[PDB]
Amino acid sequence: VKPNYTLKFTLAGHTKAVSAVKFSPNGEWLASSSADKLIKIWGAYDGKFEKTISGHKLGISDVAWSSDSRLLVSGSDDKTLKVWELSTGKSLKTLKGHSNYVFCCNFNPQSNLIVSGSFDESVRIWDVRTGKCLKTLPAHSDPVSAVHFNRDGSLIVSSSYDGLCRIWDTASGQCLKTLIDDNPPVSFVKFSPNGKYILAATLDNTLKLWDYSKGKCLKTYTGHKNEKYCIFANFSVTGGKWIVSGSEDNMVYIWNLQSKEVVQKLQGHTDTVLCTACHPTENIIASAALENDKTIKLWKSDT
Amino acid sequence: DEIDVVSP
Amino acid sequence: LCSRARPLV
């Protein structure tokens, strides 16, 4: 059982490193964020440039979609987050309160809340309607690399360069759990679609799939290079069950979720592949890379 | 030993 | 360059 992603489109337009790429939940759009201070929207199936969204003062490190594909949230080195209305390009709110670069962000499923993580070592939960910060969690002792809500919004996972991965009760703000052999920086983390497992990446060229309730590592995936950058990893579940991640050898890696065999390496980028994302219904992968490449690529497979 | 990531 | 595009120190 094995995939065959082939290159279909290359999208260009960013003038600096592309920091994140993300499909709209409705499957129609691809958003990209960049150090060039911009967000760009592309048609998810044809890769056709849709529009540019501007307003951040400095580069953007992450960008994310509301549940209804109408809004987007971004986090910037200008210490703020901004909520965008897709259809109009408006900056509806500007979320202020972090004391250093905002690195990562996400809506909850209900999309009435946003979670953020920052170089200032905190995780914040914001009210989407009022733009006010509801809670500041003193989550880590080093910059916060990723944040993500589980399926029903009850839980938040964070990760940090301090080597910890932590689970938080959304309602109370309490730390319910802390994952722990060495303490290599944790560069990325994300719940599984069903909310039972946690995919985590560490700066020792390793991805691990955790059962977070039992606090035990169930799978480990290697072959890629990852010692420097906070690279996105994904579950691909529309066809075969894969793990998908970028890599510092300019290649997109695809593992079999069960066997942990590398089943495909997508070639064609000319710098570190920092971001990847999986389309929600079709077997379509998006990828994008750093300063020396700056292009976004779309790949499709029959499985 | 196979994990399901979609279903509850 | 935004934070994510800068390597581990």
PDB file of N, CA, C and O in Angstrom, chain A residues 19 60-61 77 101 103 228 230 232, chain C:
ATOM      1  N   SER A  19       6.746  30.626   5.445  1.00  0.00           N
ATOM      2  CA  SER A  19       6.775  30.109   6.818  1.00  0.00           C
ATOM      3  C   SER A  19       5.692  29.078   7.108  1.00  0.00           C
ATOM      4  O   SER A  19       5.912  28.169   7.906  1.00  0.00           O
ATOM      5  N   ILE A  60       5.739  37.099   9.097  1.00  0.00           N
ATOM      6  CA  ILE A  60       4.758  36.192   9.701  1.00  0.00           C
ATOM      7  C   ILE A  60       5.335  34.794   9.776  1.00  0.00           C
ATOM      8  O   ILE A  60       5.913  34.337   8.808  1.00  0.00           O
ATOM      9  N   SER A  61       5.157  34.115  10.913  1.00  0.00           N
ATOM     10  CA  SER A  61       5.688  32.759  11.111  1.00  0.00           C
ATOM     11  C   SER A  61       4.628  31.656  10.969  1.00  0.00           C
ATOM     12  O   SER A  61       4.978  30.501  10.728  1.00  0.00           O
ATOM     13  N   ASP A  77       6.292  38.565  13.915  1.00  0.00           N
ATOM     14  CA  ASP A  77       7.386  39.105  14.700  1.00  0.00           C
ATOM     15  C   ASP A  77       7.069  40.477  15.273  1.00  0.00           C
ATOM     16  O   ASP A  77       7.735  40.905  16.206  1.00  0.00           O
ATOM     17  N   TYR A 101       8.078  37.737  19.845  1.00  0.00           N
ATOM     18  CA  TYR A 101       7.547  37.270  18.562  1.00  0.00           C
ATOM     19  C   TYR A 101       6.460  36.233  18.798  1.00  0.00           C
ATOM     20  O   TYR A 101       6.618  35.364  19.647  1.00  0.00           O
ATOM     21  N   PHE A 103       4.811  33.032  17.361  1.00  0.00           N
ATOM     22  CA  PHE A 103       5.385  31.984  16.517  1.00  0.00           C
ATOM     23  C   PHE A 103       4.327  31.081  15.888  1.00  0.00           C
ATOM     24  O   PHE A 103       4.465  30.676  14.750  1.00  0.00           O
ATOM     25  N   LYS A 228      17.213  22.263  12.983  1.00  0.00           N
ATOM     26  CA  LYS A 228      17.351  23.711  12.961  1.00  0.00           C
ATOM     27  C   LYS A 228      16.041  24.468  12.942  1.00  0.00           C
ATOM     28  O   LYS A 228      15.928  25.508  13.583  1.00  0.00           O
ATOM     29  N   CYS A 230      11.590  24.860  12.735  1.00  0.00           N
ATOM     30  CA  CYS A 230      10.338  24.333  13.249  1.00  0.00           C
ATOM     31  C   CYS A 230       9.440  23.960  12.064  1.00  0.00           C
ATOM     32  O   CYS A 230       8.678  24.772  11.548  1.00  0.00           O
ATOM     33  N   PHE A 232       6.590  21.883   9.976  1.00  0.00           N
ATOM     34  CA  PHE A 232       5.250  21.321  10.121  1.00  0.00           C
ATOM     35  C   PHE A 232       5.235  19.825   9.770  1.00  0.00           C
ATOM     36  O   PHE A 232       5.886  19.385   8.820  1.00  0.00           O
TER      37      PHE A 232
ATOM     38  N   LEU C   1      13.566  38.498   8.177  1.00  0.00           N
ATOM     39  CA  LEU C   1      13.193  37.077   8.400  1.00  0.00           C
ATOM     40  C   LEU C   1      12.397  36.871   9.685  1.00  0.00           C
ATOM     41  O   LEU C   1      12.862  37.217  10.770  1.00  0.00           O
ATOM     42  N   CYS C   2      11.214  36.271   9.558  1.00  0.00           N
ATOM     43  CA  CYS C   2      10.388  35.920  10.705  1.00  0.00           C
ATOM     44  C   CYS C   2      11.044  34.808  11.516  1.00  0.00           C
ATOM     45  O   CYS C   2      11.923  34.114  11.023  1.00  0.00           O
ATOM     46  N   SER C   3      10.603  34.641  12.759  1.00  0.00           N
ATOM     47  CA  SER C   3      11.257  33.721  13.704  1.00  0.00           C
ATOM     48  C   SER C   3      11.411  32.292  13.194  1.00  0.00           C
ATOM     49  O   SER C   3      12.473  31.680  13.358  1.00  0.00           O
ATOM     50  N   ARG C   4      10.355  31.766  12.582  1.00  0.00           N
ATOM     51  CA  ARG C   4      10.340  30.379  12.129  1.00  0.00           C
ATOM     52  C   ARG C   4      11.359  30.140  11.017  1.00  0.00           C
ATOM     53  O   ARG C   4      11.856  29.025  10.850  1.00  0.00           O
ATOM     54  N   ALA C   5      11.676  31.189  10.269  1.00  0.00           N
ATOM     55  CA  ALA C   5      12.656  31.102   9.192  1.00  0.00           C
ATOM     56  C   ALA C   5      14.094  31.327   9.670  1.00  0.00           C
ATOM     57  O   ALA C   5      15.005  31.422   8.841  1.00  0.00           O
ATOM     58  N   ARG C   6      14.293  31.418  10.987  1.00  0.00           N
ATOM     59  CA  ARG C   6      15.631  31.521  11.576  1.00  0.00           C
ATOM     60  C   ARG C   6      15.995  30.206  12.281  1.00  0.00           C
ATOM     61  O   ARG C   6      15.178  29.632  13.009  1.00  0.00           O
ATOM     62  N   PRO C   7      17.227  29.720  12.052  1.00  0.00           N
ATOM     63  CA  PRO C   7      17.632  28.426  12.598  1.00  0.00           C
ATOM     64  C   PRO C   7      17.722  28.423  14.121  1.00  0.00           C
ATOM     65  O   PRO C   7      17.753  29.480  14.746  1.00  0.00           O
ATOM     66  N   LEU C   8      17.758  27.235  14.711  1.00  0.00           N
ATOM     67  CA  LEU C   8      18.051  27.123  16.126  1.00  0.00           C
ATOM     68  C   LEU C   8      19.414  27.774  16.387  1.00  0.00           C
ATOM     69  O   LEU C   8      20.375  27.565  15.637  1.00  0.00           O
ATOM     70  N   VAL C   9      19.485  28.560  17.456  1.00  0.00           N
ATOM     71  CA  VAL C   9      20.684  29.339  17.763  1.00  0.00           C
ATOM     72  C   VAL C   9      21.842  28.422  18.167  1.00  0.00           C
ATOM     73  O   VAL C   9      21.838  27.839  19.249  1.00  0.00           O
TER      74      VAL C   9
END
